[PDB]
Amino acid sequence: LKDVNHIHPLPDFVRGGFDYVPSDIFSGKENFEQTLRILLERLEFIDQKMVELAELRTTLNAEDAILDEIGRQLGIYRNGLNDPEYRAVIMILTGNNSKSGTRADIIATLKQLFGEDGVTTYKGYNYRLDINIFNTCMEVTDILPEIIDMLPLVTHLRVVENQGY
Amino acid sequence: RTVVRTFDFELSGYPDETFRVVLDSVTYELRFMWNERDESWFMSLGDIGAQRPTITSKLTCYSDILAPYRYLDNVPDGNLYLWPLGDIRTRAGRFNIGPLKGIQMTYSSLIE
Amino acid sequence: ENYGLTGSGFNLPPMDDLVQETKKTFKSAFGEDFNTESNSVADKLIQIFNEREYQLWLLMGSVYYAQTMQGAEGIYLDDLLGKRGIYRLGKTRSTGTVDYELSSDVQVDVRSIEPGYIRDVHSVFIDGSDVESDNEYRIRAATSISEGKATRPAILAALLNKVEGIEKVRIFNNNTDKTNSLGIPPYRFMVVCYGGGTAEISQVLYDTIATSNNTYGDTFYDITTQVERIWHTKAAARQLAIRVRYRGRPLSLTEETAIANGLATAVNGTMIAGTLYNVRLVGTVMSSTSPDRFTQVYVDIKNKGQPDSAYVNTDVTASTTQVLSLELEDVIFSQI
Amino acid sequence: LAIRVRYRGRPLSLTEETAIANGLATAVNGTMIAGTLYNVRLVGTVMSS
């Protein structure tokens, strides 16, 4: 019924405070109101930017200019990656820390990179595993090094990518 | 790290409570401030008569408050937690802190 | 719009500007013919409010800077790396061998009684370790921790946290049908470590590898729960020597220590069977001291005991079972 | 001046060369007459930013 995240712009900030004019003594004088409005409306701008200072620092929306700072703390350097996929690698490596490389587990990680039906996985008798891609939205060669990391120590892997079925 | 429960807290809901407590035979002074917009309790910890508090943090349920601060000679080495007595989904409030109000703020000390 | 977080950084408006547009907009509501010059009553009022408002911008900038890695200091440093789930150490105690007390009962080891810094010489032990300072605290944060298993990062993470005395580790993989260039049998992988025990790492490895003993290495040690054995190797086996030549203003004596110790970190941090790049070594010297102190720089590398004629400037690597190491009594400074 | 940079490593991506380009702004800080590039300094800067 209520949002748990209380960090939001204050609703109707301006009309508040004006509500503290005692008994409409000054209201309708058009000389005191403008002086008060001009000062209060400055806080509006500062109040608004208080959110982006917290909202924009999250990894989901962080821009490349500062996303590097988030990656730097985790040891994931930009190298030659671009912004749209640099976000992906950060998620992939971080998610690897609570993984076991099971068949059900592997499907889950690939799920975040290719939608619901964009990926499928065949399995083979002698350590063979196969990955199929149908709806890639980013160039895969640069993402490939991580795709190896979350697999068992002895996996034998093939990678094939195509658009659609 | 064996630990034993040894102290419990209660709050009357006044927005600027301040009182002195004794833990592990040492004495500390605590300050609690209520935040309106964030509807949460702010806790400050320090020595008796200290100019400034040693530690300030925001209270939350099932979070180890003292975790990153067990490296100072004036900080308790025990465990401080807030967990609910009722439904597990209830979050810390203003008047719902106490041994029977819904949230059990507790301190426990390691066995040495 | 040019104020606050902007992706390229954080921008803070100075005191003067905030007054300028405040007066401008304030003037717009009453026309030009409105006194706002110095010492005027209106101007005096404006200054008070803007100064109170200005602190808000300064506070925001401090909060952002306080939470960045570069600006982390004191307690604020603890919070930032605390977010990663690790905390600084405390008063640490010495360990000895048969002020002090026995660590456990004995029959047909040694533990210090005092809480910290400390009767520590041969034929009368780990000393020091009072408080874990920020510099090494930053270093200790370089590691990683995870609960994963059966994957390459998981193996590395577990070993560095459980195996006592471990200092470095690397893994080589041969996931193909035919023996690799390193002679690894097909469908097997090798683990090489430096330091640590032999009948303990095997125990740790057993709990973290998949249910298919694909290990291979020089030495083995059987374990049971059914019986099997685990393989591994040990490398050690190298110490280096360095000389540096430069042109300019001599570096007294203190700087050489700052330069010398700084180099030891970069060389030491190299991976097992890694490679050293002459360019990287130069870069460290340009960064371990203030710029604008040298016009030319060269570094020469040779193994201990070799003749002086053996100094070379080309990049150097190490074999599979070799680990690069550097120490003092090294780093010969000279002016060209 | 015209400056060319060559290196061995991963290919640098567009908009990542901006830091290097602006990093060479130090080249505009030379003093009259007594201005010497000390290309080693440039190598340090390009490897720093």
Order of helices and strands of chain A: HHHHHEEHE
Determine the number of helices of chain A (DSSP H or I, runs of at least 4 residues): 6
Distance between the termini of chain A: 43 Å
| Percentage of residues in strands of chain A | 5-15%
Strand order of the largest sheet of chain A: 1-2-3
Largest sheet of chain A: 3 strands, mixed
Q: DSSP strand (E) fraction of chain C? A: 15-25%
Radius of gyration of chain C: 30 Å
PDB class: viral protein
Keywords: baseplate, Sheath, PhiTE, Virus, Phage, viral protein, tube initiator, hub, puncture apparatus, fibers, wedge, tape measure protein
Entry title: Bacteriophage PhiTE extended baseplate
Chain A: Wedge 1 protein
Describe the protein in words.
- This is part of a larger assembly, with one copy of chain A (165 residues), one copy of chain B (112 residues) and two copies of chain C.
- Chain A is of the alpha+beta class.
- Chain A is built from six helices and three strands, in the order αααααββαβ.
- Chain A is 41% helix and 10% strand.
- In chain A, α3 (64-74) packs parallel to α4 (83-95).
- The longest helix of chain A has 24 residues, at 32-55.
- Chain B has 112 residues and is an all-beta fold.
- Helices cover 0% and strands 44% of the residues of chain B.
- Chain C has 336 residues and is an alpha+beta fold.
- Helices cover 30% and strands 21% of the residues of chain C.
- The longest helix of chain C has 26 residues, at 41-66.
- The two termini of chain C are 54 Å apart.
- In chain C, 15% of the residues are buried.
- Chains in contact: A-B, A-C, A-D, B-C, C-D.
- The interface between C and D is small, with 12 and 8 residues.
- Chain B: Residues 10-107 form the Cyanophage baseplate Pam3 plug gp18 domain.
